[PDB]
């Protein structure tokens, strides 16, 4: 109920290190695909860690 | 006119967006301000 919302902007985000590292038990993307994340430049990114 | 004040409570309980006009700096400090009843800036005459 106190999920940490962090602002991510004005930086180069390398999602490959997250995707290739199989330490996660659930890496699901809905509006995009995890493999194509390294070719899109995003307007604004929210991180919600909890 | 020297700027505008924004917020929801304006008594240091919550955040407050603030804008001031100046020839050098237009600082937009988003802080927790314990705002006064009459926030005003005086200039000599």
């Amino acid at each position, epitope marked *: *109920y*106190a999920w*940490n*919302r962090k602002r991510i902007s004005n930086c180069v985000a390398d999602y490959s290190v997250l995707y290739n590292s199989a330490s996660f038990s659930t890496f699901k993307c809905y509006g995009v695909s995890p493999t194509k994340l390294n070719d899109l430049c995003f307007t604004n990114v929210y991180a919600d860690s909890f | 006119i020297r700027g505008w004040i924004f917020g929801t409570t304006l008594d*240091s*309980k*919550t*955040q407050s967006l603030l804008i001031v006009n100046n020839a050098t700096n237009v600082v937009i400090k988003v802080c927790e301000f314990q705002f006064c009843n009459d926030p005003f800036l005086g200039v000599y005459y």
Partner: nanobody
Amino acid sequence: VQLQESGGGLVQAGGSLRLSCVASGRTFSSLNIVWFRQAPGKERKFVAAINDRNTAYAESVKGRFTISRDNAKNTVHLQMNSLKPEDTAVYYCHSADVNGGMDYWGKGTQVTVSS
């Protein structure tokens, strides 16, 4: 940035204690406190919460306590009255800010009471 909970000394049944949860911060008045209870090896529970305008206690401490606020100090304090030997627990205190969800959990204080 953090919270430290100190106190919880050795007292007698029916006595009065003064436990303070001093917070490293600058708007802890907005960060309303919640007190939690854990039995010595049993399931956890809450105690009280002075959420600004009003208060809310637990069934074990219903009205027996005098919860207090130190808004000029950004610290919280609980008054313990009619203490019982069956309330031997480790009280907690926590506050979460409205913006950017986050926790400032403390450490705990013993509530050992003789019978």
